[PDB]
Design a protein around this ligand. Structure first.
Ligand code: SF4
Ligand code: SF4
Ligand code: SF4
Ligand code: SF4
Ligand code: FES
Lengths: 127, 58, 754, 120, 58, 196, 116, 166
């Protein structure tokens, strides 16, 4: 319901992290997508806390090692997903009220995400 | 069908002008039927048989 | 033939054929996505599912296309159930198809889009529409991934067009892609990271979405807006039909034009991307040497100059030396002129020691009916896509049935992922080739040895095992086609020996030349005079130049008139008049295709400023010389062409011109037959078309060379920087240097400049 | 949509760091020849960005052909008048007016505030 | 016949939608009638129907 | 209904009878027999000859017997003291070689000008017609203009820095003959209709 | 006015009608059809058609042959006033000279009919 | 000899000329019907020196080329233009005239400015009457010389020295 909001707020959060890691390691970031519902929004209420629907971390070859996508506004089954290229690792962030934002059921933290990132970055290291 | 809905504003004004017009129409008519000069300019002229109206296409 | 009834109409159509094609012949249609022209089907799209009676009705809707035909068959396509299903599959397809239409640049060419709207629509007269049943979030995956210096990849475009992956197998038989993860998690990728195949770019056209696009024209124009100008290629001697997509009188994009004579649906990469020089700074106002510098002049000012230049000239002092980029018309006019006013020679830039008028040409379609191909040369470089035509030959395919639409869209005769032969061809290159992938008979020869091979096949020298097996094979090959290089045509003896063998068992020849329209110009007698000289050599003291010649050419002259399209270092201390010349795109005239076929070249609609063809300019030199050539226009030239006895619209022409003027020297530097030409090295292809220097690891070592770097080299054909290639297929004792521009097969002298 | 073909549009792909429009494509050149503009309105209907929204302008007229092919920056929601109006208002130093009023804005416009019964 | 365009020609070189531009551009008076008449023709052809309210407005 | 005594006759004379499901009907005649046939109709109580549309079928994506075809629309005005509302077309395919055809000035003085137009726009000389002149077009432009063959006459539109549009390839528009970017079409894009 | 109440204002078959623009936001299929509609525009089937109508100016009608392209293969316009003008030398037989002006005017010329 | 070349005269006479504008409309289009509108009934023109609104160049020198035109009209218009007195101004009214709106055709004449020189364009087909007012206000101050172009460039106070006057 309003789950939505905290999720969005979480999505920003996560994104923020993605940038941080990006700068931290100096690794390449690229915003991928923006909301359809921003484009074709044109007088109908927009209030999303960012404009960004999809964004990714790339190796420095334009090849991502990590993709990060939010669900759109009215697009049901609202979750945020991650997936590591060539790994078949598909992560489904739910939000759980009374907890926070959970990875399956385990609460996400930044470090979790960093660990995922480093193992990605270093392992797959396509370039 | 048309591409969007009517204005609401359309309704007042539409009534309004229907009120005024009957009277107005009359007053234009009023200029013509009398004015015996109106007669003397118009009546005789503009002739053509109905039959020929179709033949030549009217 | 097979008795088909598709719904309400019957057709004969011989057996082994796809239902699909008869459908389209019948004027009935279906949505179609997987299978395609010139390619073996798969079932994957599943769009060609119909029901059929023969009279009952199948319990499962077979992909008609995949299935063969049957006599007395009924095909049902107007089925209510079909239409419903079509929509169905459409919806299914659309499930993750990311919304991107306005910025989609598949766009007008989004055939997918068009099928959607054709065949789609909800099952319900409606009083309220429906659009979906879907509503969940889509997949988000990969985009903005540059796949190549020419090609951008945004992955979620793909419909799982399997076409390209398929292409790579079918057409080049060289693979570089693959599906990756399974199920829905899947997606196609490369692990080449930039695909080093010589044919690649066709996939842009094949991509039935906009995943693979020409970045160079990304966000530059829109599909519909372009004028798609069918015209002719000339950039390789195949000179394929092409289509110049243009807006603002500027070349947006080259796409294939699908003549099934000189390609089918196939283009070289060099052809498609190697066009930016045209899109770039080019000569567009006449120049003259002042006293120290070049001066912006008119045509008139030049004509005055021409008279001046021809006031102390006898016309035997004058050299006419053309590019290998001249039309029949310009040829014809040169011919007639050099008659009229004798000059000591006519030549053209790419011209060789022994013509292709020493041999038959052949057809590509001829080459499918063939037995064996004995190959000496390099299809990949010289005649690129012929390489591919051979691949098909080799993969065993017999000529396509062409009907009331030409090509069908399924190969049942051949079926993908399946063998090829090696022993159906013989190969001679002086080094490495991709052909060796399919070759077992392959041989790296020394440069000058080619003749000897020939000699040995005739049996007056002793071959190798390969050459022996070859000997045998040529016997056993009842109608083989002999394929001849640059190293062949430029070396008299080799040519002679070939000439013998190919006569002995009479048989057609495919003559790959570094000249483009070598054969037309040959026919137009643009060959040395009896006293003569070559295009490379000086033979005059004044000159007309359709091209930038050899350095040694420039010395031996004192008035030089160049009709060029750009400036080059060779000119600003050797020029006396430079003039603007039109692109081959925007040139007008007729060319003699390597097949033997005459083709017209459309003028392209492009900006050019001033650039009034060599036709006019050559005419005007003659005007400056007191000689009216009987024509100076296209129109009269067509007449005059026809007069020379050529029937327009792809005549086959025949003539045997025997001149066997020797001219070889033995160098230690090679002119390697290359796939690129100097002026192409601009744009993003700047690097792609830079020079390479190949040498045996041994000689590399011995000269203490860095084998990653680029090295300065000085040749009498210019100073090149060249990446250093180790390659033991090059025997030491020669340096193979990638010859940008025409000219190959030569042993040439230069120096490893330091 | 423009039957007059009244639009010369050079496209471009936005800056990734500094995108002039959030999109990946924008209009690097946006020209309109008002000398034949159809002001289709269908124009508006096709545009999906709702970029194009008819104004309330009509105070346009000048002496020179090629001045009347209004540019991008003249075609914004950020200008304060018509080209001649504005050009006058600098040389004269006078301010602006446009002499129209509506009952209220059109919802479609949602930037610029026009005189509306409460301005002129 | 000192004026003329050849609308009839031109409109074969524009879309159906586009043609609706042309229809009131040859009747200074009742513009909408031309338009309607053309509309109807098309509507008939592909068999499309029009809402009652639409028809009211029309 | 006035129509019907024509219809049985038409059928009797074997003339093909076109019909659109929109209830529009043509009668395909030869040139020769037309005049008299049509004479008989007016006699049979056909009030009003509304139209003459000259047709150029230079290029069509189906075969037709002739390139030039005329079509009359005859009507019976029921609001008149005679008539039944009986409205129908007559189509008459026309040799390109002879752009002749006897007038119907003879039965309506409307015709006069209508046929004049048709001389201008398509090449047809209607036999027995007083005056051919253009009544609608220059006589300094020739070639019986408004034909498919006949030029379309475009000019590039101009924008800053001379940047121009050429109309005739700008268009994403098409004809049925035309294929566009697509290699084929079917479905909707081969037309569509409804019944529901 | 009596017969007026809420209702959709155009045909809701989105195949043949451009869709509402408040839904591009939503489905792809929308987007597709929308895009398509305003670019290419539909293909009506092959046919000729005519409808007679009463204009203010008289008998109005369009004889439209479409070949099933995106543009018609014939647009004939029935222009009443033009036909009505044929009857002018007739109408103006033996008339008086100041009167002749009015006699033209009274018939109503809209030159568009005529000129086309 | 036209009221110039002393400080006084030129301003005087120019005020005279500017304020007395007598429109001769050259209807052949929809423009006319809007033009009669443009005259009366909401706004006036009599306060801009106009009782002349009618067909004599023998009454006017303000040429309003109002509407889309054909080939047949070019010499006609030319001649009509010629049969005006020596100072004379050319308004090119509306899109239909000015560059030929939405027609590209042999029949039509596109870019009316071809036939005769112009000084004022006023786009829009239809435009608003009021735009025309704005235009003549322009034209007022234009012939007053208190005008430029959009590049600050000055211009003559007449239309009639851009091509030959007579
Ligand atoms: S691939 Fe086709 S359907 Fe998809 S966004 Fe591109 S043009 Fe649209
Ligand atoms: S990239 Fe294109 S051609 Fe290749 S499989 Fe995908 S949809 Fe088919
Ligand atoms: S194969 Fe030759 S002819 Fe064909 S596109 Fe390539 S260079 Fe041009
Ligand atoms: S610009 Fe418009 S109002 Fe003026 S003549 Fe042209 S179509 Fe008519
Ligand atoms: S299943 Fe795709 S074309 Fe046959």
């Amino acid at each position: 319901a309003s789950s939505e909001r905290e999720l969005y707020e979480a999505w920003v959060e996560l994104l923020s992290w993605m940038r941080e890691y990006a700068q931290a390691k100096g690794v390449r970031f690229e915003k991928e997508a923006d909301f359809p519902d921003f484009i074709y929004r044109m007088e109908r209420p927009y209030d999303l806390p960012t404009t960004i629907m999809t964004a990714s971390l790339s190796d420095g070859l334009g090849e991502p090692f990590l993709l990060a996508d939010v669900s759109p506004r009215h697009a049901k089954l609202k979750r945020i997903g991650l997936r590591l290229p060539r790994a078949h690792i598909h992560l489904h962030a739910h939000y759980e009220p009374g907890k926070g934002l959970v990875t399956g059921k385990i609460p996400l933290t930044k470090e979790r995400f960093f660990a995922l990132a480093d193992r990605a970055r270093e392992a797959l290291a396509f370039a | 069908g048309v591409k969007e809905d009517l204005p609401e504003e359309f309704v007042p004004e539409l009534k309004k002008l229907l009120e005024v017009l009957p009277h107005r129409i009359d007053e234009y008519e009023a200029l013509f039927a009398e004015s015996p000069i109106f007669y003397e300019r118009a009546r005789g002229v503009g002739v053509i048989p109905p039959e020929v109206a179709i033949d030549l296409g009217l | 033939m097979v008795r088909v009834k598709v719904n309400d109409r019957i057709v004969e159509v011989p057996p082994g054929t796809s239902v699909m094609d008869a459908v389209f012949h019948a004027g009935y249609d279906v949505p179609l996505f997987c299978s395609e022209k010139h390619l073996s089907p798969i079932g994957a799209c599943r769009m060609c599912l119909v029901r059929i009676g023969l009279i009952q009705w199948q319990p499962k809707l077979a992909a008609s296309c995949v299935t063969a035909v049957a006599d007395g068959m009924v095909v049902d396509t107007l089925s209510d159930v079909v239409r419903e299903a079509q929509a169905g599959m459409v919806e299914f397809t659309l499930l993750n198809h990311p919304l991107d239409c306005p910025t989609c640049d598949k766009g007008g060419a989004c055939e997918l889009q068009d099928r959607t709207v054709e065949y789609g629509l909800y099952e319900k007269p409606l009083e309220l529409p429906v659009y979906t049943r879907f509503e969940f979030t889509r997949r988000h995956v990969d985009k903005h991934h540059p796949l190549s210096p020419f090609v951008i990849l945004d992955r979620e475009r793909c419909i799982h067009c399997k076409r390209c992956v398929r292409y790579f197998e079918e057409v080049p038989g060289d693979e570089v892609l693959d599906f990756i993860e399974r199920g829905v998690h899947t997606f196609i990728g490369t692990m080449d990271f930039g695909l080093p195949s010589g044919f690649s770019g066709n996939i842009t056209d094949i991509c039935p979405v906009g995943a693979l696009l020409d970045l160079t024209a990304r966000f530059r124009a829109r599909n519909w807006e372009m004028e798609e100008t069918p015209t002719t290629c000339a950039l390789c001697p195949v000179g394929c039909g092409i289509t110049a997509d243009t807006r603002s009188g500027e070349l947006l994009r080259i796409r294939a034009r699908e003549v099934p004579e000189v390609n089918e649906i196939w283009i070289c990469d060099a052809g498609r991307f190697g066009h930016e020089w045209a899109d770039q700074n080019r000569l567009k106002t006449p120049l003259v040497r002042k006293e120290g510098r070049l001066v912006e002049a008119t045509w008139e000012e030049a004509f005055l100059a021409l008279k001046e230049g021809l006031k102390e000239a006898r016309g035997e002092e004058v050299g006419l030396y053309l590019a290998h980029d001249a039309t029949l018309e310009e040829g014809l006019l040169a011919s007639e002129l050099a008659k009229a006013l004798k000059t000591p020679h006519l030549d053209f830039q790419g011209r060789t020691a022994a013509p292709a008028s020493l041999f038959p040409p052949a057809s590509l379609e001829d080459l499918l009916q063939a037995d064996f191909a004995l190959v000496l040369g390099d299809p990949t470089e010289e005649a690129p896509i012929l390489h591919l035509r051979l691949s098909e030959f080799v993969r065993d395919l017999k000529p396509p049935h062409r009907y009331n639409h030409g090509t069908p869209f399924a190969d049942l005769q051949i079926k993908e992922r399946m063998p090829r032969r090696t022993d159906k061809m013989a190969l001679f290159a002086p080094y490495r080739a991709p052909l060796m992938k399919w070759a077992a008979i392959h041989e790296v020869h020394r440069p000058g040895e080619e003749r000897e091979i020939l000699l040995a096949l005739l049996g007056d020298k002793e071959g190798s095992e390969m050459v022996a097996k070859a000997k045998e094979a040529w016997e056993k090959a009842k109608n083989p086609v002999l394929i001849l290089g640059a190293g062949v045509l430029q070396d008299t003896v080799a040519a002679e020996r070939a000439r013998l063998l190919a006569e002995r068992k009479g048989a057609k020849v495919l003559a790959m030349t570094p000249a483009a329209n070598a054969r037309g110009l040959e026919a137009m007698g643009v060959l040395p005079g009896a006293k003569g000289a070559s295009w490379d050599e000086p033979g005059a003291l004044y000159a007309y130049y359709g091209f930038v010649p050899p350095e040694e050419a420039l010395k031996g002259k004192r008035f030089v008139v160049m009709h060029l399209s750009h400036l080059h270092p060779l000119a600003e201390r050797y020029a006396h008049v430079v003039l603007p010349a039109p692109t081959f795109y925007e040139k007008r005239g007729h060319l003699v295709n390597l097949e033997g076929r005459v083709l017209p070249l459309s003028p392209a609609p492009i900006e050019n400023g001033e650039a009034e063809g060599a036709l006019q300019v050559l005419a005007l030199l003659a005007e400056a010389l007191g000689v009216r050539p009987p024509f100076r226009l296209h129109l009269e030239a067509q007449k005059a062409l026809k007069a020379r006895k050529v029937p327009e619209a792809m005549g086959r022409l025949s003539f045997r011109l025997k001149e066997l003027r020797p001219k070889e020297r033995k160098g230690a530097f090679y002119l390697r037959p290359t796939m690129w030409k100097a002026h192409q090295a601009v744009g993003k292809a700047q690097e792609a078309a830079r020079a390479e220097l190949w040498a045996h690891p041994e000689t590399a070592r011995a000269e203490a060379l860095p084998e990653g770097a680029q090295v300065a080299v000085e040749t009498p054909f210019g100073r090149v920087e060249a990446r250093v290639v180790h390659r033991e297929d090059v025997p030491k004792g020669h340096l193979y240097l990638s010859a940008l521009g025409p000219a190959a097969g030569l042993r040439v002298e230069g120096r490893v400049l330091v | 949509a423009c039957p007059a073909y009244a639009i010369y549009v050079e496209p471009a792909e936005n800056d990734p760091e500094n995108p002039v429009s959030a999109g990946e494509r924008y209009a690097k050149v946006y020209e309109i020849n008002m000398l034949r503009c159809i002001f289709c309105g269908l124009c508006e209907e096709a545009c999906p960005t709702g970029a194009i929204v008819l104004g309330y302008d009509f105070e346009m007229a000048d002496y020179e052909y090629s001045d009347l092919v209004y540019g991008k920056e003249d075609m914004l929601v950020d200008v304060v008048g018509t080209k001649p109006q504005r050009r006058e208002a600098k040389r004269t130093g006078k301010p602006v007016k446009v002499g129209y009023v509506v009952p209220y804005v059109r919802p479609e416009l949602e930037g610029f505030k026009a005189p509306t019964e409460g301005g002129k | 016949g000192y004026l003329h365009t050849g609308f009839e020609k031109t409109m074969e070189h524009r879309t159906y939608l586009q043609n609706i531009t042309y229809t009131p551009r040859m009747d200074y008076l009742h513009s909408f009638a031309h338009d309607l008449a053309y509309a109807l023709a098309v509507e008939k052809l592909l068999g499309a129907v029009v809402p009652p309210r639409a028809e009211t407005i029309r | 209904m006035r129509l019907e005594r024509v219809l049985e006759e038409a059928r009797a004379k074997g003339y093909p009878i076109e019909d659109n499901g929109l209830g529009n009907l043509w009668v395909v005649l030869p040139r020769e027999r037309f005049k008299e046939e049509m004479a008989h109709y007016k006699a049979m109580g056909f009030n009003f000859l509304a139209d003459i549309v000259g047709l150029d079928y230079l290029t069509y994506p189906d075969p037709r017997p002739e390139r030039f075809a005329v079509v009359y629309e005859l009507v019976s005005l029921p609001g008149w003291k005679d008539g039944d509302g009986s409205r129908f077309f007559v189509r008459v395919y026309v040799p390109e070689e002879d752009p002749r055809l006897p007038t119907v000035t003879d039965l309506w003085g409307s015709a006069n000008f209508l046929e004049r137009e048709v001389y201008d726009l398509f090449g047809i000389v209607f036999e027995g017609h007083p005056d051919l002149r253009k009544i609608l077009t220059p006589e300094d432009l020739e070639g019986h203009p408004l034909r498919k063959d006949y030029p379309l006459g475009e000019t590039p539109t101009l924008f800053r820095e001379g940047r121009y549009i050429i109309p005739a390839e700008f268009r994403a528009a098409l004809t049925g003959k035309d294929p566009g970017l697509t290699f084929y079409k079917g479905g909707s894009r081969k037309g569509y209709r409804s019944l529901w | 006015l009596e017969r007026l109440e809420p209702g959709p204002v155009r045909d809701p078959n989105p195949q043949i009608t451009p869709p509402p623009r408040h839904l591009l936001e939503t489905s792809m299929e929308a987007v597709i059809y929308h895009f398509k509609h305003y670019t290419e525009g539909f293909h009506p089937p092959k046919g000729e058609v005519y409808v007679p109508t009463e204009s203010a100016r008289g008998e109005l009608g369009y004889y439209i042959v479409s070949d099933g392209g995106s543009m018609p293969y014939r647009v004939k316009v029935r222009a009443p006033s033009f036909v009505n003008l044929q009857s002018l030398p007739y109408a103006c037989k033996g008339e008086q000279v100041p009167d002749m002006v009015a006699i033209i005017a009274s018939l109503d010329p809209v030159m568009g009919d005529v000129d086309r | 000899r036209e009221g110039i070349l002393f400080t006084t005269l030129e301003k005087l006479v120019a005020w005279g000329r500017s304020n007395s504008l007598w429109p001769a409309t050259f209807g052949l289009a929809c423009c006319a019907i809007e033009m009669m509108a443009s005259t009366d009934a909401r706004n006036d023109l009599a306060r801009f020196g106009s009782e002349v609104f009618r067909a004599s160049p023998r009454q006017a020198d303000v040429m309003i080329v109002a509407g889309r035109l054909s080939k047949k009209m070019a010499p006609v218009m030319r001649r009509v233009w010629e049969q005006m007195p020596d100072p004379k101004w050319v308004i090119s009214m509306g899109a239909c005239a000015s560059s030929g709106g939405m027609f590209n055709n042999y029949a039509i004449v596109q870019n009316v400015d071809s036939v005769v020189p112009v000084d004022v364009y006023v786009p829009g087909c239809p435009p608003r009457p009021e735009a025309l007012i704005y235009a003549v206000m322009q034209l007022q101050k234009k012939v007053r010389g208190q005008a430029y172009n959009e590049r600050g460039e000055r211009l003559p106070p007449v239309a009639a020295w851009k091509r030959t006057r007579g």
